[PDB]
Amino acid sequence: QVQLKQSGPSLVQPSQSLSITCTVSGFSLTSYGVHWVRQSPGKGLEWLGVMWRGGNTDYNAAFMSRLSITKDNSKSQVFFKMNSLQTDDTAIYYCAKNGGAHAMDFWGQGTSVTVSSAKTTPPSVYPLAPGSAAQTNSMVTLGCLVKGYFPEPVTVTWNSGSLSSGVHTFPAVLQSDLYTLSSSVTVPSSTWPSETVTCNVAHPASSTKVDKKI
Amino acid sequence: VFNATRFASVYAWNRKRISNCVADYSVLYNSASFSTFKCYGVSPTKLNDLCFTNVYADSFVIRGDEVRQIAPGQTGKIADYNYKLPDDFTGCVIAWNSNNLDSKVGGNYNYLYRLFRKSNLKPFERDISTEIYQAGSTPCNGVEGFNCYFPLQSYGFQPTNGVGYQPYRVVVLSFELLHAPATVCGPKKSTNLVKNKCVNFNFNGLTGTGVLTESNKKFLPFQQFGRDIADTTDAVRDPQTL
Amino acid sequence: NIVLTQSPASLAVSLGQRATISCRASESVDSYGNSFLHWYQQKPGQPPKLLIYLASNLESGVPARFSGSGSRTDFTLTIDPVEADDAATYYCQQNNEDPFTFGSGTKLEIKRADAAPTVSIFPPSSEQLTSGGASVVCFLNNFYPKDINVKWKIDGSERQNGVLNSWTDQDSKDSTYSMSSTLTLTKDEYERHNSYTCEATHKTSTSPIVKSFNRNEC
């Protein structure tokens, strides 16, 4: 129903500018002002700015001189003009619906902004299966290796998200123009090797979908 | 108002003016269908057989823990900025569940309520204005932003809410009785009929004790009871069929 | 410049107790009729979401355990009773004065009993060895507290160049910790020596976590 996902940017380089467009769904753009935050650069959440109901913009002390918000009422789209991006500005930008007292009641998925001129690298998706000499206790441990991919975002799950209790996903490490991601799951012997288990990996940054049977 | 198709907000309630009719209030109190039925200053069973000048039914929705704010001698954001009742409010506040009635797929976020107002509302004062007011001495001059809060807040409506977070269809019955004619009353009990025996009676116009009989006496349909030469109780019109 | 000094950085509270996440502010108060802040909750695998606005109002969909209050400078978030599905990072938001900054974020953790980590090694598949790479992964999951140090030790010589750990914070429902240790090697390095061992030292586990495997065990 409510969708506030971000799209638009193709390549974010350092000391350059590029616009980000956040989708507006579930409410009228002229009624609520889209808020902007980034994904915890070090300490907790940080504020970027807020757009008025068709008026002006407010920004943070650190991001006023670097970032700017532009409201397009003709296209019903919220633009976010970035300027003078550095290597430390790599983070996920989020949009939110305005509450009463400038709150953020609803949240979107956003987009992963990585400040680097490196070329796109596809993921080295391979399964982490137990060996022939591996032991078991009536349950098997399976994993998937998504290493050497760039840039963010990326999706990893098990059987398109069939299980959610025993599924665990690890955070992606911010390497030099690279990322390392992995996952793990605890399933019984009746589900593997008795049944087929497939790890679904999708890389929206490169639009690559690699499936590997364990 | 109790079976309304749509219930309005706490600040834009649908006020139904009841006048020139009868209505039983104990029929709903002992119905075992509504959750809350609390009257202030008078029991709901006592006012069932008492007339009033006017009766207003204010239909709106609030949460479980918010019903305490709508009462005499109680403060709150909804009680000060949306719907202020007087400290001597002698009315009633009826409420019942609404999760299986007003909910929809994904939740009903259409209800709203005001968090703040420039001034406190007077007793029985409705306000449907959405004017954006300023926090301090630096006004935003119109649109929202820069310490200019929007007056209305979104209302969460999910099926897995708690007992305090559950919305309730509230219907506040504000009663008033003044020197003006009492236009609102309640119905009476059933009727009986026994003839040829000295028995007590209470008809629509009078009461007393007498013997009920039948005869060929005429009576003007535009009258209720008759009197004799000495102004004594004489033949009367049946409140039922003529 | 509004810097919300949100303290403490984390909490070790057991089930059924009352957790206290404070949030200090400097500017400002008396906006309309209060000066409270908005509180949020971000899990390790979910974006943040609004729990309570202005620390004194009701919100549907969230459990009743979330409450709070606050003075003109110090604001308090109250979580009572602490259940087994509220392990996440909480924040506070300034709204009564520009900039609308946020706090540093307090990691509310469920104080469970100490436990040792598991051990399981995953040598590379036939496809990886055929291409030329050799990625070994040693998972240490279901442990408490977060104090864990994993070090790959090749039997010829300890390797600390291609090692890399991905430590996951305490999940919401799963009240234990999890970390994935990886090691990037080629087919020549994997075929160099026969036996390879995944070593690690945990605070709870008095005995060292040691599991050896051979290159032919696949």
Place this chain on the structure above:
Amino acid sequence: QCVNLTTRTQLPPAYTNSFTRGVYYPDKVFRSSVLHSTQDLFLPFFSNVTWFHAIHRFDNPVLPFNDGVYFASTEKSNIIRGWIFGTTLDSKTQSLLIVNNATNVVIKVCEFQFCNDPFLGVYYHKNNKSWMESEFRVYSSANNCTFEYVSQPFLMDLEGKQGNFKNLREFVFKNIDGYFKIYSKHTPINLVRDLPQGFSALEPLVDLPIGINITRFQTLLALHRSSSGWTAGAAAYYVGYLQPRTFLLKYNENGTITDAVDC
């Protein structure tokens, strides 16, 4: 609206003498074959009452309602359409409006902003008559309504007829603790002059528990034209002021009041 009629011929306020009219049942006490002495607002017998005409002379003045008013209407074309009651007859306070547009008897209490001259208009009264009403200029708007009543549908004779007076409609309006008691009586007649010399008791019509202060009143009249060049048919009404005097009520064997006596 603010359109004043030009066909109104300025003539002095003629009056007549009621013989014994203005008597009604003062309460719901049924009696038969007795003389009931009681003090209530009745018209003194052989008293002077005004004479207003509604013809192509058209009187509709603002007359007082301090003590009590009695109505009598001799009509041959059914020109009467309703009455207006209030303190100042404007939207400053509540005003009781009674309307009879030959389809429904509407009785409402609002802040009616009455026009300079309320009336209803019958169009094309000469050729292709049809006796249809389409103009409704009783008031402009209304606010803060406290009472509303609408009768069942019907059809009143809108035929403008000539000859002698054939309809004698008499009403009484008083206030008792806000309970406005309205009376009515319709009987046929054959009259060519002022009010007839006879007797007739008026019965209760309705009881309106409104509770307003009334000091003035007006009367609705129907016009005809084939809004200043409008004329009226053939009808006249009378106004009599009530007084709290003692009167006897001669109830017959059937229980209806056939005669009365003044004090």
